[PDB]
Amino acid sequence: SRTSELAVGIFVIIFGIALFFLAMKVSGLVGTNLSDGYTMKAQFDNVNGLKPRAKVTMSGVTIGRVDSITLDPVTRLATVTFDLDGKLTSFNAEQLKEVQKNALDELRYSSDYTQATPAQQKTMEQQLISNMNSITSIDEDAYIMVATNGLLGEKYLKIVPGGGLNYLKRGDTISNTQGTMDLEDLISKFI
């Protein structure tokens, strides 16, 4: 009876290595993918006490991980670089259109067509093609910073979406950053 004798050994093995490829997924190794992520950057003054490969949130929900932080010795200032997601920081094709027609409702607005130019077509023709490219759903002056996650744990990146018109593309630079202030700065501040 080679019918089942061979059906016992084979059905174990293909299932049995399918257990091992589960162990490659939940080990932090080669699996556990993302959605077509990309590396922006920002420049702080000090992030000291930061762990890399940490969490990065939009408001209170994870949108990606930090990639690298490196110093330049001439100006003595740190520069960060982090990965986001292309499903949480992205657009629908519809949602790309709803901001582009609202771009001309903001660039050539009822007050903005009155005190920028009476024929500001260069603001009107450029909001077309800039929106058509790969844009990110993260605003113009939305400053990024470092939080603490409670009282314990470890620091992570916090995006404060303060207003927004002029959106960002892949690899751009947020020019508004806030460094960390630990407990020893707070005591000397008080007394």
Partner: protein, 256 residues
């Protein structure tokens, strides 16, 4: 594709191999009590229980001292070592007395039981007893089973008690905490009907799987005394996969 067939026919045999062993178990407990079995049973509990008492007492200490060493080294920088009497007790009551006292019991009396029955099949005392009609399941096996179900929960209790006393020894006599905060931090947090009685229900259903798998591999082994020694190391593998596997399925029930 032939080694595939060898693996396939091996685990087909292991399934049938279980279905025999369940039938032997229901044939033991559903029987009338033999005449004068109590005198056989008490002598059997002498063999399985009282012999194993020393190796679990002095192994009760060394689990307790390392719990009284890392339990101190962790709790000193957090400072709140009002939990030393609680983080010695709640691990030793919930997990390490059901788990570690099983792997030491499968070692000594778990494996000396499958030899003693493995020797009795080979010299054919068990065959000679059948021709006189004394049916050796009720004569040799059944006192060697009931001295294993009763004698393991009488051991984890002795394991957990000497473990906690061991944690108090290197804790407050060589490192030093409040002797008041030990028990008063203990007695309040540890319920009886939720923790100790659940620490024994786990130690009964470990005693069943650790003995019924042990007394089976002695009975249904083969002769040719490379057939004993392949079976005395067939329990100690098959016990420890089923001690720990049945532990985790249990602790999610009572401590979900």
């Amino acid at each position: 594709m032939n080694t595939i067939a060898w693996l396939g026919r091996l685990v087909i045999e292991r399934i049938r191999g279980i279905g025999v062993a369940a039938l032997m178990l229901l044939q033991i407990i559903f029987s009338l009590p033999s005449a004068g079995g109590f005198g056989r049973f008490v002598y059997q509990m002498h063999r399985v229980g009282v012999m194993s008492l020393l190796i679990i007492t002095v192994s009760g200490l060394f689990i307790g001292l390392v719990l009284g060493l890392q339990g101190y080294s962790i709790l000193v920088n957090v400072g709140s070592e009002s939990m030393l009497g609680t983080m010695v007790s709640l691990t030793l009551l919930r997990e390490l007395a059901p788990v570690v006292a099983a792997l030491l019991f499968a070692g000594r009396a778990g494996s000396a039981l499958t030899a003693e029955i493995g020797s009795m099949k080979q010299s054919e005392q068990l065959a000679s007893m059948e021709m006189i009609g004394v049916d050796p399941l009720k004569q040799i096996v059944s006192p060697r089973l009931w001295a294993g179900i009763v004698s393991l929960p009488m051991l984890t209790v002795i394991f957990a008690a000497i473990g906690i006393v061991g944690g108090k020894l290197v804790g407050v006599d060589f490192l030093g905490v409040d002797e008041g905060s030990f028990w008063s931090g203990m007695q309040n947090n540890v319920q009886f009907g939720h923790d100790v009685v659940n620490g024994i229900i786990k130690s009964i259903v470990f005693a069943l799987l650790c003995t019924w798998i042990a007394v089976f591999q002695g009975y249904a082994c083969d002769p040719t005394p490379e057939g004993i020694a392949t079976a005395m190391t067939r329990t100690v593998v098959y016990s420890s996969l089923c001690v720990l596997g049945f532990d985790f399925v249990l602790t999610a029930v009572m401590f979900g």
